[PDB]
């Protein structure tokens, strides 16, 4: 899988 | 929200990855619909071969926000273009800034 679901960290 | 040039309302996640990868350029980004959460959107940016994707949702009162980590203040924006402008700036908590719009 080339998609990574990330989250705003700041 | 067709007025968002980077918004691709008919593409899949896979199609989103191929468009970005085709740029060969880190920092290229687009917006698409989520294919897991109806009604939610995904802001997608290329970094070192992978597509870092941030789910973006509209409030019941119209504003926009990106999925945010635990213990971090969540930011809301009136206009989606405003959320997009914010994340084009350095050091805003995403993997690399939004740099090269992949437009319709």
Does the beta-carbon distance from B67 to A7 stay under 8 Å? Answer: yes
Please provide the distance, in angstroms rounded to a whole number, between the alpha carbons at the two ends of chain B: 12
Exposure letters A1-10 (e unless 16+ CB within 10 A, then b): eebeebebee
Domains identified in chain B, total number? 1
The CA distances from residue B90 to B5, B72, B85, in Å, are 22, 17, 11
Chain A nearest-CA residue for B70: A9
Report the C-alpha gap between B15 and B12 in whole angstroms. Answer: 5
Encoding tokens for residue B34? 């989520």
* Residues of chain A numbered 1-10 and touching chain B (CB < 8 Å): 2-10
Supply the CATH number for residue B48's domain: 3.30.505.10
Domain of B62, in residue numbers: 1-104
CB A9 within 8 A of CB B69: yes
Which among B33, B39, B36, B43 is positioned nearest to B9, based on CA atoms? B33
């Amino acid at each position: 899988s080339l998609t990574i679901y990330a989250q705003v960290q700041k | 929200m067709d007025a968002v040039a980077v918004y691709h309302g008919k593409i899949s996640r896979e199609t989103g990855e191929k468009l970005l990868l085709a740029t060969g350029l880190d920092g290229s980004y687009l917006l698409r619909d989520s294919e897991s959460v109806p009604g939610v959107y995904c802001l997608c940016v290329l970094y070192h071969g992978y597509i870092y994707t941030y789910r973006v949702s509209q409030t019941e009162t119209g504003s926009w926000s990106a999925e945010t980590a635990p213990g971090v203040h969540k930011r809301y924006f009136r206009k989606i273009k405003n959320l997009i402008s914010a994340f084009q700036k350095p050091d805003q908590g995403i993997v690399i800034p939004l740099q090269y719009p992949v437009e319709k």
